[PDB]
């Protein structure tokens, strides 16, 4: 059950790397209508503390990210939507076809909503993101970036 689910891997191949990244936009279009169906109130004045709290447990698969701070200078400035989301890494695909892996070690990601911009500090958000929606996101420490 452990090695039998891990025969080859669940990892990508060489041929899906060139799948014409603008065709991954309906995956972002599905996520864009998902956020409007989640809170269903955006415009006049509707609780910015609620928006950043519902995105704690929200499955952010297929969302645009842009690195505005990282400990590595080479990681900063990479844009694209994400496909996989592992323990402390998540694989993104960028502009004209090439995929990149950015670890969730000490960095923050910028997620652009319709009328909101939310930073996600990737040093606390780890540990198998299916379990992130479950339990145990408590208040610990600061993020010195």
Q: Is 14 one of the binding residues for RNA (CB under 7 A)?
A: no
Residue choice 31, 75, 116, 121 for contact with RNA (CB under 7 A): 75
| Ordered alpha helix ranges (H), the chain | 25-36, 48-54
Q: Which does 53 bind (CB under 5 to 8 A by kind): another protein, RNA, none?
A: another protein
Q: Which does 46 bind (CB under 5 to 8 A by kind): another protein, RNA, none?
A: none
Q: How far apart are CA 78 and CA 5, in angstroms?
A: 32
In 8-78, the DSSP E strands lie at 64-70
CA-nearest of 138, 56, 132, 143 to 105 is 143
DSSP assigned state of 42: -
Instruction: Tell me whether residue 28 or residue 88 sits nearer to RNA (CB atom).
Output: 88
Q: Which does 101 bind (CB under 5 to 8 A by kind): another protein, RNA, none?
A: RNA
Residue choice 14, 135, 141, 142 for contact with RNA (CB under 7 A): 135
Q: Is 21 one of the binding residues for RNA (CB under 7 A)?
A: no
Q: Is 106 one of the binding residues for RNA (CB under 7 A)?
A: no
Tokens of 139: 């208040």
Q: Other C-beta atoms within 10 Å of 56: how many?
A: 11
- Residues near RNA, by CB under 7 A: 72, 74-75, 78, 99-103, 127, 134-136, 138-140
């Amino acid at each position: 059950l452990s090695a039998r689910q891990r025969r080859e891997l669940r990892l990508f191949d060489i041929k899906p790397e060139q799948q014409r990244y603008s065709l991954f936009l309906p995956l972002h279009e599905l996520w864009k209508q998902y956020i409007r169906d989640l809170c269903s109130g955006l415009k006049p004045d509707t609780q910015p503390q609620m928006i950043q709290a519902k995105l704690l447990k929200a499955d952010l698969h297929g969302a645009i990210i842009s690195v505005t701070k990282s400990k590595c200078p080479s990681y900063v400035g990479i844009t694209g939507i994400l496909l996989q989301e592992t323990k402390h890494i998540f694989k993104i695909i960028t502009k004209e076809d090439r995929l990149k892996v950015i670890p969730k070690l000490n960095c923050v990601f910028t997620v652009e909503t319709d009328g909101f911009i939310s930073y996600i500090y990737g040093s606390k958000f780890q540990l198998r993101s299916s379990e992130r929606s479950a339990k145990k996101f408590k208040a610990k420490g600061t993020i010195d970036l």
